[PDB]
Amino acid sequence: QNNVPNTFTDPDSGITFNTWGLDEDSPQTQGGFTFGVALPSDALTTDASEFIGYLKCARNDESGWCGISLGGPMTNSLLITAWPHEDTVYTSLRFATGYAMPDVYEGDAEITQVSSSVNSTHFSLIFRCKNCLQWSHGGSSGGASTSGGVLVLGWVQAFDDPGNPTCPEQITLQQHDNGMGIWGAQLNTDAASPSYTDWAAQATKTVT
Ligand code: HEM
Ligand SMILES: *[C@@H]1O[C@H](CO)[C@@H](O)[C@H](O)[C@H]1NC(C)=O
Ligand SMILES: *[C@H]1O[C@H](CO)[C@@H](O)[C@H](O)[C@@H]1O
Ligand SMILES: *[C@H]1O[C@H](CO)[C@@H](O)[C@H](O)[C@@H]1O
Ligand SMILES: *[C@H]1O[C@H](CO)[C@@H](O)[C@H](O)[C@@H]1O
Ligand SMILES: *[C@H]1O[C@H](CO)[C@@H](O)[C@H](O)[C@@H]1O
Ligand SMILES: [Mg+2]
C-alpha cells in the first residue's frame, strides 16, 4: 500500500479519512483494498485509544473476507476481521499468538457501525473502534501510537466466506489467499479533526 496517505471525505457521514490501499490493477490483491482512519483531534500529539475506520474490501464471485492487523504482523496484535452476508457487514475482533486461527479478542475493544454497503464486487464499512489502539490478550500487551505520525499496519484479503457467517464469535476461516502485506501508514493533519466527537456519535449500530 501507499505509505503517504490519500485523503477522502465520505459523502453521507461527512467523515474525513487518511487512506491507504491498493488499486484494482495492483498485482498484490484481486479487486483492490482500501483502509482509512479518522482520529481524535489531538491524536498527532497524544496517543489515541480509538479511531473511526473505513474499509473497502473485494469480493470474488460474491465471496470473501478481509482483515487488518493494528500492530503489523498477524501475531500479538489486535485484529479486525470483516465480511458481508446478505446485506450486512460483520466484524470480529481477533488476536493470535501464533500463525493459526485467531481467537476472539479477550480485551474490552468494541466496534460499532456508522454505515455499510454490499454489492456484488465489494463491501465497505465505516466503523468506530473503541479501545482498539492499546490491547491486551493472554499476557500479550501492545499498541499503536498515533503521536508518532505513522501506524504500522497489516492487511489480508481472502476468497472464501467464513464459516458460521452470521455469528462473529464462532466464525471459522481458511488461511487468507488473496494477498497480504505490512506497511507504514503515515498520518497527516487531515487524519485528526475537531469534528471527531461528532463523527464518533454517528456510530450507533451494534451488529451482533
Ligand atoms: C485460520 C485463519 C488464518 C491462518 C491459518 C493464517 C495463517 C497465516 C500464515 C501462515 C502467514 C504467513 C504467510 C507468509 O509468511 O508467507 C500469515 C500472514 C499474515 N496474516 Fe494470517 N492467518 C489466518 C487469519 C488471519 C486473520 C484473521 C488476520 C487479520 C485480520 C491475519 C493477518 C495476517 C497478516 C497481516 C499477515 C502478514 C504479516 C505476517 O506474516 O505476520 N491472518 N497468516
Ligand atoms: C460496489 O460497492 C462498492 C462499495 O465500496 C463501491 O465502491 C463500488 O463503486 C460499487 N460498484 C458498483 C458498480 O455499484
Ligand atoms: C468537522 O466536521 C464537522 C461536522 O461536519 C464540521 O461542522 C466542522 O467544520 C469540521 O470541519
Ligand atoms: C464533539 O464533542 C467535543 C467535546 O469534546 C466538541 O469539542 C466537538 O466540537 C464535537 O462537537
Ligand atoms: C444510530 O443512528 C443512526 C442515524 O444516525 C440510525 O439510523 C441507526 O439506526 C442508529 O439507531
Ligand atoms: C449497540 O449496542 C452496544 C452494546 O450491545 C452499545 O455499546 C453500542 O453503543 C450500541 O448501542
Ligand atoms: Mg509520519
Q: Whose CA is nearest to atom 7 of ligand 2?
A: 122
Give the separation between CA 76 and CA 66, rounded to whole angstroms. Answer: 18
Method: X-ray
Q: Whose CA is nearest to atom 5 of ligand 2?
A: 124
Sign, Cα dihedral of 90, 166, 74, 111: positive
**Radius of gyration, alpha carbons of the chain:** 16
Q: Which amino acid is residue 80, in one-letter code? A: I
Instruction: Indicate the resolution in Å.
Output: 1.4
Q: Whose CA is nearest to atom 10 of ligand 5?
A: 204
The atom of ligand 1 lying closest to the CA of 75 is: 41
Place of cell 454497503: 117
Report the CATH number at residue 82. 2.60.40.1210
Q: Whose CA is nearest to atom 3 of ligand 3?
A: 195
Contacts of 56 (CB under 8 A, 6+ apart): 21, 32, 33, 34, 35, 122, 123, 124
Say whether 160 sits in a helix, a strand or coil: coil
Give the separation between CA 26 and CA 181, rounded to whole angstroms. Answer: 13
Q: Which amino acid is residue 59, in one-letter code? A: R
Three-point CA angle 154, 159, 165, nearest 5°: 90
DSSP for 33-75, please give it.
Answer: EEEEEEB-TTTTTS--S-EEEEEEEE-BTTB-EEEEESSSSSS
Residue range of the domain that includes 114? 2-208
Exposure letters 48-73 (e unless 16+ CB within 10 A, then b): bebbbbbbbbbbbeeebbbbbbbbbe
Strand order in the sheet with 33-38: 6-9, 16-22, 33-38, 51-58, 122-130, 110-118
The domain tally of the chain equals 1
Give the separation between CA 200 and CA 129, rounded to whole angstroms. Answer: 9
From the list 138, 115, 141, the residue with the least C-alpha distance to 13 is 115
List ligand 2's pocket residues with C-beta within 6 A.
Answer: 56, 117, 119, 121-122, 124
Give the separation between CA 173 and CA 11, rounded to whole angstroms. Answer: 33
Place of cell 489480508: 156
Contacts of 27 (CB under 8 A, 6+ apart): none
Give the separation between CA 90 and CA 70, rounded to whole angstroms. Answer: 18
The atom of ligand 1 lying closest to the CA of 154 is: 35
Q: Is 54 annotated among the ligand-binding residues?
A: no
Q: Is 174 annotated among the ligand-binding residues?
A: no
Give the separation between CA 122 and CA 84, rounded to whole angstroms. Answer: 9
Q: Return the bridge partners of 83, or none.
A: 90
Mutate to test the pocket of ligand 2, among 117, 120, 157 (most ligand atoms within 8 A of CB): 117
Element (H or E) spanning 137, and its range?
strand 134-137
Task: Spell out the alpha helix ranges (H) of the chain.
Answer: 196-200
Give the separation between CA 24 and CA 56, rounded to whole angstroms. Answer: 12
